[PDB]
Design a protein around this nucleic acid. Structure first.
Length: 55
RNA sequence: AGUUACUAAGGGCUUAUGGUGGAUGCCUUGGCACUAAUAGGCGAUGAAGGACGUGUUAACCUGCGAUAAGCUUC
């Protein structure tokens, strides 16, 4: 699931993806602060996602 | 007038038990001293050592560094 990210617009689409991931990660963590986050597993994945893109 | 078993508040001796206490005996992911090979350094591309932080997981230990108990590639 990385060669499927090299092929994307490795110059510009990835920037939009990065900002979207940061936003939804922030909203995930905020949901975790209160209640109503019923899939606590999404945080570890989404951070794991950015680690590839920046790479 | 006289003789002498019983007393045991408590103690003593042996023998049996019970409690504390952790020596002797068996053992060990630990240490010690050595051999034979390898290698004899790290660092402005910012080290050694430290702080601080990071979790679906409280603290601590460990790993790791805002890509943060993990990322890419063979």
């Amino acid at each position: 699931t990385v060669a499927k990210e090299l092929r994307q617009k490795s110059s510009e689409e990835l920037v939009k993806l990065v900002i979207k991931l940061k936003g939804e990660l922030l909203e995930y963590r905020f949901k975790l602060a209160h209640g109503e986050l019923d899939k606590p597993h999404l945080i570890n994945q989404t951070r794991r996602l950015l680690a590839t893109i920046l790479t």
